[PDB]
Write an enzyme that holds these catalytic residues in place. Structure first.
Site, PDB file in Angstrom:
ATOM      1  CE1 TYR A   1      -3.854   2.301   0.376  1.00  0.00           C
ATOM      2  CE2 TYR A   1      -2.710   3.225   2.259  1.00  0.00           C
ATOM      3  CZ  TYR A   1      -3.734   3.285   1.333  1.00  0.00           C
ATOM      4  OH  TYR A   1      -4.639   4.326   1.355  1.00  0.00           O
TER       5      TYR A   1
ATOM      6  CG  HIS B   1      -7.270   4.945  -1.280  1.00  0.00           C
ATOM      7  ND1 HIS B   1      -6.792   4.030  -0.370  1.00  0.00           N
ATOM      8  CD2 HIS B   1      -8.552   4.588  -1.549  1.00  0.00           C
ATOM      9  CE1 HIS B   1      -7.747   3.150  -0.098  1.00  0.00           C
ATOM     10  NE2 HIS B   1      -8.820   3.472  -0.796  1.00  0.00           N
TER      11      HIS B   1
HETATM   12  C1  LIG Z   1       1.803  12.599  -9.503  1.00  0.00           C
HETATM   13  C2  LIG Z   1       3.229  12.832  -9.100  1.00  0.00           C
HETATM   14  C3  LIG Z   1       3.526  12.064  -7.839  1.00  0.00           C
HETATM   15  C4  LIG Z   1       4.201  12.393 -10.181  1.00  0.00           C
HETATM   16  O1  LIG Z   1       5.426  13.005  -9.862  1.00  0.00           O
HETATM   17  P1  LIG Z   1       6.483  13.432 -10.968  1.00  0.00           P
HETATM   18  O2  LIG Z   1       7.879  13.391 -10.339  1.00  0.00           O
HETATM   19  O3  LIG Z   1       6.161  14.820 -11.512  1.00  0.00           O
HETATM   20  O4  LIG Z   1       6.384  12.398 -12.172  1.00  0.00           O
HETATM   21  P2  LIG Z   1       7.591  11.911 -13.099  1.00  0.00           P
HETATM   22  O5  LIG Z   1       8.372  13.070 -13.716  1.00  0.00           O
HETATM   23  O6  LIG Z   1       8.516  10.976 -12.333  1.00  0.00           O
HETATM   24  O7  LIG Z   1       6.899  11.087 -14.249  1.00  0.00           O
HETATM   25  C5  LIG Z   1       6.462  11.855 -15.337  1.00  0.00           C
HETATM   26  C6  LIG Z   1       5.888  10.983 -16.430  1.00  0.00           C
HETATM   27  O8  LIG Z   1       4.683  10.327 -16.003  1.00  0.00           O
HETATM   28  C7  LIG Z   1       3.618  10.949 -16.679  1.00  0.00           C
HETATM   29  N1  LIG Z   1       2.978  12.011 -15.943  1.00  0.00           N
HETATM   30  C8  LIG Z   1       3.286  12.434 -14.695  1.00  0.00           C
HETATM   31  N2  LIG Z   1       2.510  13.456 -14.333  1.00  0.00           N
HETATM   32  C9  LIG Z   1       1.667  13.731 -15.337  1.00  0.00           C
HETATM   33  C10 LIG Z   1       0.658  14.678 -15.530  1.00  0.00           C
HETATM   34  N3  LIG Z   1       0.969  16.035 -15.142  1.00  0.00           N
HETATM   35  N4  LIG Z   1      -0.220  14.455 -16.545  1.00  0.00           N
HETATM   36  C11 LIG Z   1       0.038  13.583 -17.553  1.00  0.00           C
HETATM   37  N5  LIG Z   1       1.217  12.903 -17.559  1.00  0.00           N
HETATM   38  C12 LIG Z   1       1.946  12.824 -16.404  1.00  0.00           C
HETATM   39  C13 LIG Z   1       4.208  11.535 -18.010  1.00  0.00           C
HETATM   40  O9  LIG Z   1       3.913  10.870 -19.309  1.00  0.00           O
HETATM   41  C14 LIG Z   1       5.653  11.879 -17.597  1.00  0.00           C
HETATM   42  O10 LIG Z   1       6.621  11.794 -18.540  1.00  0.00           O
HETATM   43  P3  LIG Z   1       7.188  13.115 -19.194  1.00  0.00           P
HETATM   44  O11 LIG Z   1       7.832  14.040 -18.152  1.00  0.00           O
HETATM   45  O12 LIG Z   1       8.230  12.756 -20.241  1.00  0.00           O
HETATM   46  O13 LIG Z   1       6.017  13.822 -19.869  1.00  0.00           O
HETATM   47  C15 LIG Z   1       3.475  14.323  -8.866  1.00  0.00           C
HETATM   48  O14 LIG Z   1       2.872  15.096  -9.851  1.00  0.00           O
HETATM   49  C16 LIG Z   1       3.027  14.835  -7.513  1.00  0.00           C
HETATM   50  O15 LIG Z   1       3.828  14.915  -6.598  1.00  0.00           O
HETATM   51  N6  LIG Z   1       1.645  15.265  -7.309  1.00  0.00           N
HETATM   52  C17 LIG Z   1       1.240  15.773  -6.011  1.00  0.00           C
HETATM   53  C18 LIG Z   1       1.246  14.616  -5.019  1.00  0.00           C
HETATM   54  C19 LIG Z   1      -0.031  13.783  -5.127  1.00  0.00           C
HETATM   55  O16 LIG Z   1      -1.105  14.307  -5.437  1.00  0.00           O
HETATM   56  N7  LIG Z   1       0.041  12.347  -4.839  1.00  0.00           N
HETATM   57  C20 LIG Z   1      -1.186  11.561  -4.931  1.00  0.00           C
HETATM   58  C21 LIG Z   1      -0.925  10.312  -5.725  1.00  0.00           C
HETATM   59  S1  LIG Z   1       0.810   9.989  -5.860  1.00  0.00           S
END
Ligand SMILES: CC(C)(COP(=O)(O)OP(=O)(O)OC[C@H]1O[C@@H](n2cnc3c(N)ncnc32)[C@H](O)[C@@H]1OP(=O)(O)O)[C@@H](O)C(=O)NCCC(=O)NCCS
EC number: 2.3.1.258
Lengths: 4, 153
Positions: free
Chosen positions: B71, B110
């Site tokens: 999880y 979740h």
């Molecule tokens: C969701 C999250 C955890 C991903 O973190 P991240 O470090 O930005 O993601 P990564 O750079 O490692 O991965 C990016 C890839 O996954 C996909 N992806 C990630 N976020 C995306 C979004 N904004 N929309 C569409 N594609 C996305 C893409 O295809 C991307 O590749 P690219 O940079 O070449 O376009 C981040 O946006 C975050 O911290 N959000 C706030 C925390 C949260 O809400 N967590 C709840 C669930 S984890």
């Protein structure tokens, strides 16, 4: 993201 | 080389993990959360951008449904460090852990139904939406949460  | 590396969570860097979670997620966890994650070792890492803590992943093991599931309680990094591959690094880390023992059926988590960017991130690594639990969050809107599961066994 866990509950509440 | 590499300017984005992961590192352990110790009692010496716990308040930094906690601070990060306050900024990144709209829910608040009490210190039970932070006590439990001190005991899971590898299932909780901080993400560094040159010795600045920018995010973290925290996991937990559920033994239920006759399954041993992983999880993901929290996975995230601060906004200006997104789209850098940090979340992939942490997800790949939890995935790397699940397949060093092979005792896992699935990994799940979740996600709030409005968080389209987290949904897009997980479905990219092969998590599918298996369930939509209504009123899963207590204090925030929208309250509904998807159950994103990835299968292993
Ligand atoms: C969701 C999250 C955890 C991903 O973190 P991240 O470090 O930005 O993601 P990564 O750079 O490692 O991965 C990016 C890839 O996954 C996909 N992806 C990630 N976020 C995306 C979004 N904004 N929309 C569409 N594609 C996305 C893409 O295809 C991307 O590749 P690219 O940079 O070449 O376009 C981040 O946006 C975050 O911290 N959000 C706030 C925390 C949260 O809400 N967590 C709840 C669930 S984890």
């Amino acid at each position: 993201m866990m509950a509440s | 080389g590499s300017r984005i590396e992961l590192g352990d969570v110790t009692p010496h860097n716990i308040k930094q993990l906690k601070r990060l979670n306050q900024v990144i997620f709209p829910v608040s966890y009490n210190d039970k959360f932070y006590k439990d994650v001190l005991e899971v070792g590898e299932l909780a890492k901080l993400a560094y951008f040159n010795d600045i803590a920018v995010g973290a992943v925290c996991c937990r093991v559920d033994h239920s449904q006759n399954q041993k599931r992983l999880y993901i309680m929290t996975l995230g990094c601060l906004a200006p460090y997104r789209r850098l591959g940090i979340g992939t690094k942490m997800l790949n880390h939890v995935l790397n852990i699940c397949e060093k023992d092979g005792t896992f059926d699935n990994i799940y988590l979740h996600v709030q139904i409005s968080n389209e960017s987290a949904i897009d991130f997980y479905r990219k690594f092969g998590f599918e939406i298996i369930e939509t639990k209504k009123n899963y969050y207590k204090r925030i809107e929208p309250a509904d949460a998807h159950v994103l599961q990835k299968n292993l066994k």
